[PDB]
Specification:
part of a larger assembly, 2 chains, A: alpha/beta, 7-stranded antiparallel beta sheet, 5-stranded parallel beta sheet, 15 helices, 35% helix, B: mainly alpha, 1 helix, binds adenosine-5'-diphosphate, DNA helicase activity (chain A)
Chain lengths: 447, 34
């Protein structure tokens, strides 16, 4: 008789690049005219094609490319297209040029955090663990007396064992306030203890208690498992520099204090490199060297640019992508010196430059269409042509930005779609950079 | 029709049938949902 269903969970939010799904190549490496949500830019998309081959080759260290071209030309969108084309597995580290100016560590070292974060590593961590209901807890003592050894009895649905354990595990059980009848998990590699709560066998022993009870664990008490960890080299560099691991008073204390950054010594990266080369030679690991993308690179300091010379040459370093949108600009921190793209010529020799074209009106229409069917809105043909008309006079971003304001006006007067009168009305409310600069230059006596 | 009518007359001398109306004078329907 009846049919029933439900769904009310909100979507992910729509965003200024969420229509980008890939580079839209064919198998020859040519760009399709419009595919994967992109249009145009073939002379750049083919080049980005060679760079996604370059990442997936793993062979190179410190190769770098610069996406250059006017505002609104899609340089960030193409860098996102590279990120989508690599999929989830390979790390892509986004960065903005003004992020180097930390107040906690030198600019020159904030770049090394990102360089070490853009190299990914995969590990088969063969952990082993004890878990169960604690049926017994009995410490053992030694000469001047103090604790020396521990008995813990554990029980699970598949058996029970009377374990013999290190007195640091007793100190750790005491810290977690573990008692008989508690269900606990112990990571034997790490001394770590997690108290889940009392076993459900005791679930009504009081009318009130603060606990939430848990079911008795399944399988044997003592067992090992092949956990697969995805981690960056930076996550090895930092965890050794201010360790929260282990069970002692010093690590337990150092976890609570303010987590200031610190200027990591090269010798520690030397140890991490020696360690991970052993994990690769044992066949435990896989390395996944990925991408560092520095958007707005043109306001790195000449300190940073002169450090990038040494970084991009390092046989460790990840592949790099830069973006810039500047002409013959003065390089920040130099005051005297003007160069292409806001980048010193000394660095500009070290990058393969990808040149980004401006759009024709007939490409504006096609981006705007693809954008409207991403915003989730319907538009009539003369209305879409009027956004293209505006796009010839103004800029690509402005013609996109008029869409949803017009869609609100459309449904505020009950229509299903944007009509030209809704775009034409919206253009009277929301000025652009060009038209505002006119009225602001006319009225300049009053501002 | 024809083959089923013969298969029915094989079964009917040794199988009974009713439809639930002998008790749905007293009982209401299943409310059935997909
Ligand atoms: N070739 C393209 N294909 C798809 N979307 C594009 C393309 N070029 C630009 N866009 C879109 O238009 C806007 C401007 O591009 P963007 O990457 O932000 O420019 P910029 O490099 O100057 O910062 C964004 O919404 C972007 O996703």
């Amino acid at each position: 008789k009846i049919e029933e269903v439900k769904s009310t969970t909100k979507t992910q939010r729509i965003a200024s690049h969420s229509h980008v799904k890939g580079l839209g190549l064919d198998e020859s490496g040519l760009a399709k005219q419009a595919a994967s949500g992109l249009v145009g830019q073939e002379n750049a998309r083919e080049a980005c094609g060679v760079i996604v081959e370059l990442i997936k080759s793993k062979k190179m260290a410190g190769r770098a490319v610069l996406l250059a071209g006017p505002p609104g030309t899609g340089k960030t969108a193409l860098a996102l297209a590279i990120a989508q084309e690599l999929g989830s597995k390979v790390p892509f580290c986004p960065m903005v040029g003004s992020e180097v100016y930390s107040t906690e560590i030198k600019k020159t070292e904030v770049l090394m955090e990102n360089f070490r974060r853009a190299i990914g590593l995969r590990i088969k961590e063969t952990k082993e663990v004890y878990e169960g209901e604690v049926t017994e807890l009995t410490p053992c003592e030694t000469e001047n007396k103090t604790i020396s050894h521990v008995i813990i009895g554990l029980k699970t649905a598949k058996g029970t064992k009377q374990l013999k354990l290190d007195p640091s595990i007793f100190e750790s059980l005491q810290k977690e306030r573990v008692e008989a009848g508690d269900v606990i998990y112990i990571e034997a590699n790490s001394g770590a203890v997690k108290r889940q709560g009392r076993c459900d066998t005791y679930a009504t022993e009081f009318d009130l208690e603060a606990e939430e009870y848990v079911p008795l664990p399944k399988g044997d008490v003592h067992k090992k498992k092949e956990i697969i960890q995805d981690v960056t080299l930076h996550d090895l560099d930092v965890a050794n520099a201010r360790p929260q691991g282990g069970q002692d008073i010093l690590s337990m204390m150092g976890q609570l204090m303010k987590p200031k950054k610190t200027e990591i010594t090269d010798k520690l990266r030397g140890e991490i490199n020696k360690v991970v080369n052993k994990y690769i030679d044992q066949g435990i690991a896989e390395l996944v060297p990925g991408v560092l993308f520095v958007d707005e690179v043109h306001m790195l300091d000449i300190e940073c640019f002169t450090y990038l010379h040494r970084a991009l040459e390092s046989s460790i370093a990840p592949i790099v992508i830069f973006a810039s949108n500047r002409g013959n600009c003065v390089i920040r921190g130099t005051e005297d010196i003007t160069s292409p793209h806001g980048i010193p010529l000394d660095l500009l020799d070290r990058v393969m430059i990808i040149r980004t074209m401006l759009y024709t009106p007939q490409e504006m229409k096609q981006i705007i269409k693809i954008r409207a069917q991403t915003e989730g809105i319907n538009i009539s043909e003369e209305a879409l042509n009027h956004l293209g008309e505006i796009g010839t006079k103004t800029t690509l971003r402005y013609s996109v930005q008029l869409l949803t304001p017009a869609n609100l006006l459309a449904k505020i007067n009950g229509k299903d779609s944007i009509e030209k009168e809704h775009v034409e009305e919206i253009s009277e409310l929301f000025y652009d950079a060009k038209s505002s600069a006119k009225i602001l230059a006319d009225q300049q006596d009053k501002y | 029709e024809n083959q089923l009518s013969r298969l029915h007359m094989i079964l009917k001398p040794f199988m009974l049938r009713r439809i639930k109306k002998d008790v749905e004078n007293e009982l209401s329907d299943k409310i059935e949902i997909l």
